[model samples]
Target: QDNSRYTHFLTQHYDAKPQGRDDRYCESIMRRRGLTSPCKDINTFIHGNKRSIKAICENKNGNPHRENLRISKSSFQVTTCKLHGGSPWPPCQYRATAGFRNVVVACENGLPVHLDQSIFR
Candidate 1:
Protein backbone atom coordinates (compact mmCIF):
# COMPACT_ATOMS: atom_id res chain seq x y z
CA GLN A 1 0.00 0.00 0.00
CA ASP A 2 1.07 3.56 -0.66
CA ASN A 3 2.11 5.80 2.23
CA SER A 4 -1.02 7.89 1.98
CA ARG A 5 -3.21 4.78 1.96
CA TYR A 6 -1.33 3.40 4.93
CA THR A 7 -1.75 6.67 6.75
CA HIS A 8 -5.46 6.64 6.06
CA PHE A 9 -5.73 3.04 7.18
CA LEU A 10 -4.05 3.81 10.49
CA THR A 11 -6.21 6.86 10.99
CA GLN A 12 -9.40 4.98 10.25
CA HIS A 13 -8.73 1.55 11.74
CA TYR A 14 -6.70 2.57 14.77
CA ASP A 15 -8.44 4.13 17.74
CA ALA A 16 -8.01 7.89 17.56
CA LYS A 17 -6.68 8.50 21.06
CA PRO A 18 -6.19 12.21 20.93
CA GLN A 19 -3.76 13.64 23.46
CA GLY A 20 -5.33 15.80 26.14
CA ARG A 21 -4.80 19.52 25.53
CA ASP A 22 -3.37 19.88 29.02
CA ASP A 23 -0.62 17.45 28.22
CA ARG A 24 1.07 20.32 26.44
CA TYR A 25 0.42 22.57 29.42
CA CYS A 26 2.11 20.22 31.83
CA GLU A 27 4.98 19.86 29.38
CA SER A 28 5.41 23.61 29.31
CA ILE A 29 5.40 23.81 33.08
CA MET A 30 8.01 21.11 33.32
CA ARG A 31 10.22 22.90 30.81
CA ARG A 32 9.98 26.16 32.73
CA ARG A 33 10.94 24.39 35.94
CA GLY A 34 14.31 23.36 34.47
CA LEU A 35 13.31 19.96 33.28
CA THR A 36 15.88 19.74 30.52
CA SER A 37 13.68 17.47 28.45
CA PRO A 38 10.02 16.76 28.12
CA CYS A 39 8.92 14.41 30.86
CA LYS A 40 9.93 10.89 29.95
CA ASP A 41 7.82 9.15 32.58
CA ILE A 42 5.17 11.23 34.21
CA ASN A 43 4.19 8.55 36.69
CA THR A 44 7.71 8.25 37.97
CA PHE A 45 8.18 11.96 38.15
CA ILE A 46 4.84 12.47 39.84
CA HIS A 47 5.43 9.71 42.31
CA GLY A 48 8.78 11.21 43.16
CA ASN A 49 7.56 14.79 43.35
CA LYS A 50 3.81 14.70 43.57
CA ARG A 51 3.52 17.91 45.57
CA SER A 52 5.49 20.00 43.10
CA ILE A 53 3.82 18.64 40.00
CA LYS A 54 0.42 18.97 41.59
CA ALA A 55 1.14 22.53 42.55
CA ILE A 56 2.07 23.25 38.99
CA CYS A 57 -1.13 21.63 37.81
CA GLU A 58 -3.16 23.78 40.11
CA ASN A 59 -1.34 27.06 39.71
CA LYS A 60 -2.49 29.66 37.20
CA ASN A 61 0.67 31.30 35.97
CA GLY A 62 -1.27 33.06 33.24
CA ASN A 63 -4.83 33.72 32.17
CA PRO A 64 -7.28 30.84 32.22
CA HIS A 65 -8.35 30.66 28.61
CA ARG A 66 -9.06 26.95 28.96
CA GLU A 67 -9.47 24.22 31.51
CA ASN A 68 -6.57 22.90 33.55
CA LEU A 69 -4.23 20.97 31.31
CA ARG A 70 -3.47 17.33 32.07
CA ILE A 71 -1.54 14.47 30.60
CA SER A 72 -3.65 11.54 29.52
CA LYS A 73 -2.34 8.00 29.84
CA SER A 74 -1.96 7.60 26.11
CA SER A 75 -0.13 10.91 25.74
CA PHE A 76 2.12 10.06 28.64
CA GLN A 77 2.90 6.69 27.16
CA VAL A 78 3.77 8.12 23.76
CA THR A 79 5.86 10.87 25.31
CA THR A 80 7.74 8.47 27.57
CA CYS A 81 8.43 6.09 24.73
CA LYS A 82 9.51 8.85 22.39
CA LEU A 83 11.81 10.55 24.87
CA HIS A 84 13.20 7.65 26.90
CA GLY A 85 13.60 5.09 24.10
CA GLY A 86 11.64 2.47 26.04
CA SER A 87 8.07 1.63 26.92
CA PRO A 88 6.78 2.93 30.24
CA TRP A 89 5.58 -0.52 31.30
CA PRO A 90 6.38 -4.12 30.58
CA PRO A 91 7.41 -5.54 27.21
CA CYS A 92 9.75 -2.62 27.13
CA GLN A 93 11.11 -1.88 23.70
CA TYR A 94 13.27 0.89 22.35
CA ARG A 95 10.94 3.25 20.54
CA ALA A 96 13.24 6.21 20.05
CA THR A 97 16.82 6.06 18.83
CA ALA A 98 17.68 9.38 20.43
CA GLY A 99 16.37 11.92 22.92
CA PHE A 100 13.43 14.05 21.85
CA ARG A 101 14.39 17.18 19.93
CA ASN A 102 13.76 20.68 21.24
CA VAL A 103 11.06 21.21 18.62
CA VAL A 104 9.22 18.12 19.78
CA VAL A 105 9.70 19.30 23.35
CA ALA A 106 7.92 22.56 22.58
CA CYS A 107 4.18 22.84 23.06
CA GLU A 108 2.34 22.17 19.80
CA ASN A 109 0.89 25.69 19.75
CA GLY A 110 2.76 26.25 16.44
CA LEU A 111 6.03 26.07 14.63
CA PRO A 112 8.61 28.90 14.58
CA VAL A 113 8.01 29.57 18.27
CA HIS A 114 11.29 30.07 20.10
CA LEU A 115 12.21 27.48 22.71
CA ASP A 116 12.91 29.25 26.01
CA GLN A 117 16.08 27.25 26.73
CA SER A 118 19.12 26.34 24.69
CA ILE A 119 18.46 22.64 24.26
CA PHE A 120 18.85 23.17 20.53
CA ARG A 121 22.23 24.84 21.05
Candidate 2:
Protein backbone atom coordinates (compact mmCIF):
# COMPACT_ATOMS: atom_id res chain seq x y z
CA GLN A 1 0.00 0.00 0.00
CA ASP A 2 2.77 2.39 0.89
CA ASN A 3 4.77 1.74 -2.25
CA SER A 4 1.56 2.00 -4.22
CA ARG A 5 0.69 5.21 -2.45
CA TYR A 6 3.99 6.72 -3.41
CA THR A 7 3.56 5.34 -6.90
CA HIS A 8 0.08 6.81 -7.11
CA PHE A 9 1.34 10.11 -5.77
CA LEU A 10 4.02 10.19 -8.42
CA THR A 11 1.88 9.18 -11.37
CA GLN A 12 -1.19 11.15 -10.39
CA HIS A 13 0.58 14.25 -9.16
CA TYR A 14 3.72 14.27 -11.24
CA ASP A 15 3.74 14.43 -15.05
CA ALA A 16 4.69 10.74 -15.34
CA LYS A 17 2.55 9.64 -18.24
CA PRO A 18 3.98 6.86 -20.40
CA GLN A 19 4.49 7.89 -24.03
CA GLY A 20 3.26 4.90 -26.07
CA ARG A 21 4.29 1.48 -24.81
CA ASP A 22 8.09 1.85 -25.15
CA ASP A 23 11.36 2.34 -23.27
CA ARG A 24 10.85 6.05 -23.09
CA TYR A 25 7.80 5.55 -20.91
CA CYS A 26 9.94 3.37 -18.70
CA GLU A 27 12.62 6.04 -18.58
CA SER A 28 10.12 8.80 -17.86
CA ILE A 29 7.84 7.19 -15.24
CA MET A 30 10.77 5.75 -13.38
CA ARG A 31 12.19 9.24 -13.16
CA ARG A 32 8.98 10.78 -11.80
CA ARG A 33 8.81 7.88 -9.35
CA GLY A 34 12.40 8.65 -8.40
CA LEU A 35 13.93 5.53 -9.92
CA THR A 36 16.01 7.25 -12.59
CA SER A 37 19.62 8.08 -13.27
CA PRO A 38 19.33 4.66 -14.89
CA CYS A 39 15.69 4.05 -13.99
CA LYS A 40 14.23 1.30 -11.79
CA ASP A 41 14.23 -2.29 -12.98
CA ILE A 42 11.37 -4.06 -11.20
CA ASN A 43 8.24 -2.40 -9.91
CA THR A 44 4.46 -2.71 -9.63
CA PHE A 45 1.51 -0.56 -8.60
CA ILE A 46 -1.71 -1.37 -6.64
CA HIS A 47 -5.38 -0.33 -6.80
CA GLY A 48 -8.29 -1.36 -4.58
CA ASN A 49 -11.47 -0.42 -2.76
CA LYS A 50 -11.60 2.15 0.00
CA ARG A 51 -13.82 -0.24 1.91
CA SER A 52 -11.56 -3.19 1.29
CA ILE A 53 -8.30 -1.37 1.91
CA LYS A 54 -9.29 0.15 5.21
CA ALA A 55 -10.42 -3.26 6.30
CA ILE A 56 -7.09 -5.03 5.83
CA CYS A 57 -6.28 -5.38 9.46
CA GLU A 58 -9.67 -6.77 10.26
CA ASN A 59 -9.35 -9.66 12.68
CA LYS A 60 -5.60 -9.23 12.62
CA ASN A 61 -4.11 -10.88 15.67
CA GLY A 62 -7.13 -13.19 15.86
CA ASN A 63 -9.97 -10.76 16.25
CA PRO A 64 -11.78 -8.21 14.11
CA HIS A 65 -13.61 -6.96 17.18
CA ARG A 66 -10.40 -5.82 18.77
CA GLU A 67 -9.83 -2.11 18.42
CA ASN A 68 -6.07 -1.94 18.82
CA LEU A 69 -5.36 -4.48 16.13
CA ARG A 70 -7.64 -2.86 13.59
CA ILE A 71 -6.71 -0.66 10.66
CA SER A 72 -8.16 2.79 10.47
CA LYS A 73 -10.91 3.67 8.01
CA SER A 74 -9.26 5.60 5.27
CA SER A 75 -9.65 5.79 1.47
CA PHE A 76 -8.75 3.16 -1.15
CA GLN A 77 -5.57 2.24 -3.11
CA VAL A 78 -5.00 1.78 -6.85
CA THR A 79 -2.35 0.66 -9.45
CA THR A 80 -0.80 0.76 -12.94
CA CYS A 81 1.85 -1.30 -14.76
CA LYS A 82 4.46 -1.05 -17.50
CA LEU A 83 5.49 -3.40 -20.28
CA HIS A 84 8.89 -3.56 -21.93
CA GLY A 85 10.84 -5.59 -24.48
CA GLY A 86 14.41 -6.70 -23.84
CA SER A 87 15.95 -4.36 -26.34
CA PRO A 88 18.71 -1.77 -26.13
CA TRP A 89 18.07 1.90 -25.47
CA PRO A 90 18.11 4.81 -28.00
CA PRO A 91 14.41 5.09 -28.06
CA CYS A 92 14.37 2.48 -25.38
CA GLN A 93 10.95 0.83 -25.46
CA TYR A 94 7.96 0.04 -23.20
CA ARG A 95 4.24 0.39 -22.61
CA ALA A 96 2.25 1.43 -19.56
CA THR A 97 -0.79 -0.65 -18.82
CA ALA A 98 -3.40 -0.12 -16.16
CA GLY A 99 -3.78 -3.24 -14.01
CA PHE A 100 -5.45 -4.91 -11.02
CA ARG A 101 -4.04 -6.86 -8.07
CA ASN A 102 -4.29 -7.26 -4.30
CA VAL A 103 -1.38 -6.09 -2.15
CA VAL A 104 0.16 -6.48 1.29
CA VAL A 105 0.75 -3.35 3.26
CA ALA A 106 2.43 -2.61 6.56
CA CYS A 107 0.78 -0.37 9.08
CA GLU A 108 1.85 2.14 11.66
CA ASN A 109 -0.20 3.88 14.36
CA GLY A 110 -3.21 1.88 13.20
CA LEU A 111 -3.10 2.96 9.56
CA PRO A 112 -1.82 1.17 6.49
CA VAL A 113 1.27 3.08 5.35
CA HIS A 114 3.78 0.93 3.45
CA LEU A 115 3.79 -1.83 0.88
CA ASP A 116 5.16 -5.28 1.61
CA GLN A 117 4.84 -6.37 -2.08
CA SER A 118 3.02 -9.71 -1.91
CA ILE A 119 -0.26 -9.48 -3.81
CA PHE A 120 -3.04 -11.76 -5.11
CA ARG A 121 -1.55 -14.62 -3.21
Candidate 3:
Protein backbone atom coordinates (compact mmCIF):
# COMPACT_ATOMS: atom_id res chain seq x y z
CA GLN A 1 0.00 0.00 0.00
CA ASP A 2 2.43 2.63 -1.19
CA ASN A 3 0.75 5.94 -1.67
CA SER A 4 3.66 8.10 -2.60
CA ARG A 5 4.65 10.59 -5.25
CA TYR A 6 7.07 8.30 -7.06
CA THR A 7 8.82 10.88 -9.22
CA HIS A 8 9.44 13.37 -6.45
CA PHE A 9 10.70 10.67 -4.10
CA LEU A 10 13.13 9.21 -6.63
CA THR A 11 14.51 12.53 -7.81
CA GLN A 12 15.11 13.97 -4.35
CA HIS A 13 16.84 10.80 -3.16
CA TYR A 14 19.05 10.04 -6.19
CA ASP A 15 19.34 13.14 -8.31
CA ALA A 16 22.99 14.03 -7.67
CA LYS A 17 25.77 11.66 -8.55
CA PRO A 18 29.23 13.16 -8.27
CA GLN A 19 30.36 13.98 -11.80
CA GLY A 20 33.70 14.78 -10.25
CA ARG A 21 34.35 13.95 -6.60
CA ASP A 22 36.62 16.56 -5.12
CA ASP A 23 36.60 19.65 -2.99
CA ARG A 24 34.69 21.47 -5.70
CA TYR A 25 32.01 18.81 -5.95
CA CYS A 26 31.16 19.02 -2.24
CA GLU A 27 31.33 22.80 -2.25
CA SER A 28 28.86 23.17 -5.11
CA ILE A 29 26.19 20.58 -4.39
CA MET A 30 26.27 21.02 -0.63
CA ARG A 31 25.41 24.67 -1.06
CA ARG A 32 22.77 23.82 -3.64
CA ARG A 33 21.33 21.08 -1.46
CA GLY A 34 21.64 23.55 1.39
CA LEU A 35 23.52 21.00 3.50
CA THR A 36 26.25 23.38 4.59
CA SER A 37 27.02 26.33 6.69
CA PRO A 38 30.76 26.35 6.06
CA CYS A 39 30.95 23.04 4.17
CA LYS A 40 30.84 19.24 4.61
CA ASP A 41 33.30 16.45 3.82
CA ILE A 42 30.96 13.45 3.58
CA ASN A 43 27.45 12.89 2.30
CA THR A 44 25.33 10.06 1.01
CA PHE A 45 22.56 9.58 -1.54
CA ILE A 46 20.32 6.63 -0.74
CA HIS A 47 19.82 4.24 -3.64
CA GLY A 48 16.78 2.14 -2.92
CA ASN A 49 13.53 1.23 -4.62
CA LYS A 50 10.22 2.82 -3.67
CA ARG A 51 8.80 -0.37 -2.21
CA SER A 52 11.39 -0.82 0.52
CA ILE A 53 11.56 2.89 1.25
CA LYS A 54 7.82 3.32 1.61
CA ALA A 55 7.63 0.40 3.96
CA ILE A 56 10.09 1.96 6.39
CA CYS A 57 7.45 4.37 7.58
CA GLU A 58 5.29 1.57 8.79
CA ASN A 59 7.99 -0.81 9.97
CA LYS A 60 8.62 0.34 13.54
CA ASN A 61 5.29 1.42 14.90
CA GLY A 62 4.71 1.26 18.63
CA ASN A 63 2.16 -1.42 18.14
CA PRO A 64 3.10 -4.06 15.63
CA HIS A 65 -0.42 -5.42 15.46
CA ARG A 66 -1.80 -2.09 14.41
CA GLU A 67 -0.56 -1.04 10.99
CA ASN A 68 -3.34 1.04 9.56
CA LEU A 69 -1.88 4.54 9.92
CA ARG A 70 0.83 4.12 12.54
CA ILE A 71 4.26 5.69 12.07
CA SER A 72 7.58 4.49 13.39
CA LYS A 73 8.71 5.66 16.80
CA SER A 74 12.15 6.34 15.31
CA SER A 75 10.74 8.76 12.74
CA PHE A 76 12.36 12.17 12.55
CA GLN A 77 10.39 15.36 12.25
CA VAL A 78 13.41 17.63 11.71
CA THR A 79 17.18 17.24 11.76
CA THR A 80 20.38 17.98 9.84
CA CYS A 81 22.59 15.74 7.74
CA LYS A 82 26.29 15.06 8.32
CA LEU A 83 28.69 17.86 7.48
CA HIS A 84 32.37 16.89 7.25
CA GLY A 85 34.53 19.37 9.07
CA GLY A 86 36.45 19.19 12.31
CA SER A 87 37.78 22.71 12.65
CA PRO A 88 34.28 24.07 13.50
CA TRP A 89 31.71 26.26 11.69
CA PRO A 90 33.83 28.80 9.82
CA PRO A 91 36.34 26.14 8.84
CA CYS A 92 33.78 23.34 8.30
CA GLN A 93 32.98 21.51 5.02
CA TYR A 94 31.49 18.24 3.70
CA ARG A 95 32.40 15.46 1.23
CA ALA A 96 31.04 12.60 -0.83
CA THR A 97 30.47 11.11 -4.32
CA ALA A 98 27.56 9.33 -6.06
CA GLY A 99 26.45 5.70 -5.96
CA PHE A 100 23.45 3.43 -5.21
CA ARG A 101 23.08 2.86 -1.48
CA ASN A 102 20.39 2.15 1.09
CA VAL A 103 19.90 5.24 3.22
CA VAL A 104 17.98 4.89 6.47
CA VAL A 105 15.78 7.66 7.77
CA ALA A 106 13.10 8.53 10.27
CA CYS A 107 9.66 9.12 8.85
CA GLU A 108 6.57 10.47 10.45
CA ASN A 109 3.05 10.00 9.11
CA GLY A 110 4.50 8.17 6.12
CA LEU A 111 6.89 10.84 4.98
CA PRO A 112 10.67 10.78 4.61
CA VAL A 113 12.35 13.19 7.02
CA HIS A 114 15.48 13.77 9.07
CA LEU A 115 19.15 12.98 8.45
CA ASP A 116 19.98 13.04 12.14
CA GLN A 117 21.59 10.00 13.72
CA SER A 118 18.91 9.68 16.38
CA ILE A 119 16.50 8.62 13.68
CA PHE A 120 19.15 7.07 11.42
CA ARG A 121 18.91 3.47 12.63
Candidate 4:
Protein backbone atom coordinates (compact mmCIF):
# COMPACT_ATOMS: atom_id res chain seq x y z
CA GLN A 1 0.00 0.00 0.00
CA ASP A 2 1.00 3.55 -0.64
CA ASN A 3 0.02 6.96 0.70
CA SER A 4 -0.91 10.01 -1.32
CA ARG A 5 0.64 13.46 -1.20
CA TYR A 6 -2.02 14.73 1.18
CA THR A 7 -1.29 11.84 3.50
CA HIS A 8 2.38 12.68 3.51
CA PHE A 9 1.41 16.29 4.04
CA LEU A 10 -0.39 15.33 7.20
CA THR A 11 2.09 12.83 8.52
CA GLN A 12 5.33 14.61 7.71
CA HIS A 13 4.46 18.25 8.38
CA TYR A 14 1.10 19.15 9.82
CA ASP A 15 0.55 19.29 13.55
CA ALA A 16 -2.47 21.21 14.71
CA LYS A 17 -1.60 21.05 18.38
CA PRO A 18 1.41 22.26 20.31
CA GLN A 19 4.15 20.03 21.63
CA GLY A 20 6.90 20.30 24.19
CA ARG A 21 10.46 21.12 23.16
CA ASP A 22 11.85 17.76 24.12
CA ASP A 23 14.41 15.48 22.53
CA ARG A 24 12.06 12.54 22.87
CA TYR A 25 9.45 14.48 20.98
CA CYS A 26 11.91 14.53 18.13
CA GLU A 27 12.54 10.81 18.25
CA SER A 28 8.85 10.09 18.69
CA ILE A 29 7.70 11.69 15.48
CA MET A 30 10.52 10.38 13.30
CA ARG A 31 10.09 6.84 14.52
CA ARG A 32 6.32 6.94 14.19
CA ARG A 33 6.59 8.44 10.71
CA GLY A 34 9.08 5.78 9.63
CA LEU A 35 11.84 8.26 8.86
CA THR A 36 14.58 6.32 10.66
CA SER A 37 17.23 3.73 10.01
CA PRO A 38 19.63 5.65 7.80
CA CYS A 39 17.50 8.43 9.29
CA LYS A 40 15.92 11.42 7.71
CA ASP A 41 18.29 14.34 7.99
CA ILE A 42 15.75 16.95 9.01
CA ASN A 43 12.07 17.71 9.35
CA THR A 44 9.90 20.65 10.33
CA PHE A 45 6.49 20.51 11.91
CA ILE A 46 3.93 23.30 11.60
CA HIS A 47 1.68 23.89 14.62
CA GLY A 48 -0.98 25.72 12.65
CA ASN A 49 -4.34 24.18 12.11
CA LYS A 50 -5.09 22.43 8.84
CA ARG A 51 -7.17 25.34 7.62
CA SER A 52 -4.27 27.73 8.01
CA ILE A 53 -1.84 25.46 6.21
CA LYS A 54 -4.26 24.76 3.40
CA ALA A 55 -4.97 28.45 3.05
CA ILE A 56 -1.37 29.00 2.00
CA CYS A 57 -2.29 27.51 -1.34
CA GLU A 58 -5.23 29.87 -1.66
CA ASN A 59 -2.84 32.79 -1.32
CA LYS A 60 -4.45 33.80 1.93
CA ASN A 61 -1.16 34.08 3.75
CA GLY A 62 1.41 33.30 1.09
CA ASN A 63 2.43 33.96 -2.47
CA PRO A 64 3.24 31.46 -5.16
CA HIS A 65 6.88 31.20 -6.10
CA ARG A 66 8.50 30.04 -9.35
CA GLU A 67 7.60 26.46 -8.67
CA ASN A 68 4.79 24.73 -6.79
CA LEU A 69 6.22 26.34 -3.66
CA ARG A 70 4.64 29.27 -1.85
CA ILE A 71 6.31 31.72 0.49
CA SER A 72 4.23 32.45 3.57
CA LYS A 73 3.10 35.98 4.21
CA SER A 74 2.85 35.22 7.89
CA SER A 75 5.00 33.48 10.42
CA PHE A 76 4.07 30.18 12.06
CA GLN A 77 4.93 28.32 15.22
CA VAL A 78 7.20 25.54 14.10
CA THR A 79 9.69 23.06 15.46
CA THR A 80 12.70 21.72 13.65
CA CYS A 81 14.04 18.25 14.30
CA LYS A 82 17.70 17.88 13.36
CA LEU A 83 19.32 14.51 13.33
CA HIS A 84 22.21 14.21 15.77
CA GLY A 85 24.89 11.62 16.36
CA GLY A 86 23.53 8.15 16.82
CA SER A 87 23.26 4.83 15.03
CA PRO A 88 20.59 4.85 12.33
CA TRP A 89 18.48 2.78 14.69
CA PRO A 90 15.61 3.23 17.14
CA PRO A 91 17.71 5.39 19.37
CA CYS A 92 18.13 7.84 16.51
CA GLN A 93 18.99 11.11 18.18
CA TYR A 94 17.62 14.52 17.32
CA ARG A 95 17.83 18.06 18.53
CA ALA A 96 14.70 20.18 18.70
CA THR A 97 14.68 23.84 17.90
CA ALA A 98 11.52 25.90 17.99
CA GLY A 99 11.02 29.13 16.16
CA PHE A 100 8.57 31.51 14.62
CA ARG A 101 9.27 31.96 10.95
CA ASN A 102 7.84 32.22 7.51
CA VAL A 103 7.62 28.91 5.72
CA VAL A 104 7.71 27.73 2.13
CA VAL A 105 5.60 24.79 1.11
CA ALA A 106 4.48 22.95 -1.97
CA CYS A 107 0.76 23.17 -2.63
CA GLU A 108 -1.60 21.11 -4.73
CA ASN A 109 -5.32 21.56 -5.24
CA GLY A 110 -5.36 24.50 -2.87
CA LEU A 111 -3.60 22.60 -0.09
CA PRO A 112 -0.03 22.34 1.12
CA VAL A 113 1.61 19.03 0.41
CA HIS A 114 5.24 19.60 1.28
CA LEU A 115 7.52 21.96 3.22
CA ASP A 116 10.25 23.45 1.07
CA GLN A 117 12.04 25.49 3.76
CA SER A 118 11.72 28.03 6.54
CA ILE A 119 12.80 31.63 6.07
CA PHE A 120 14.93 33.62 8.48
CA ARG A 121 12.72 36.68 8.49
Q: Which candidate gets the maximum lDDT versus the true structure? A: 4
Stretches of candidate 3 off by over 4 Å are: 1-18, 38-42, 47-52, 58-85, 90-93, 97-100, 116-121
Show where candidate 4 strays beyond 4 Å: 1-3, 118-121
Q: Write the per-residue lDDT of candidate 1 for residues 86-115, one digit (tens) a residue.
A: 444422222221122211111122111111
Q: RMSD in angstroms, all models?
A: 15.7, 7.9, 8.1, 3.0
The candidate with the higher TM-score, 3 or 4, is 4
For TM-score, candidate 1 versus 2, the one ahead is: 2
Ranking by TM-score: 4, 3, 2, 1
TM-score of 1: 0.21
lDDT score, residue 26, model 3? Answer: 50
* lDDT per residue as tens, model 2, 4-69: 554453343223233353445545655555544343334544343333544555543212323333
| Alpha-carbon TM-score of each model against the true structure | 0.21, 0.41, 0.43, 0.85
Q: How high is the CA lDDT of each candidate model?
A: 0.26, 0.41, 0.44, 0.77
> Whole-model lDDT, candidate 1?
0.26
lDDT, candidate 3, at 104: 56
Cα lDDT tens digits, model 3, 13-39, are 433224455555555555665545545
Clashes of 1: 2
The candidate, 2 or 3, that scores higher on lDDT is: 3
* Distance from true location, Cα of 29 in model 2, Å: 3.0
Q: For candidate 1, give the lDDT of residue 63.
A: 19
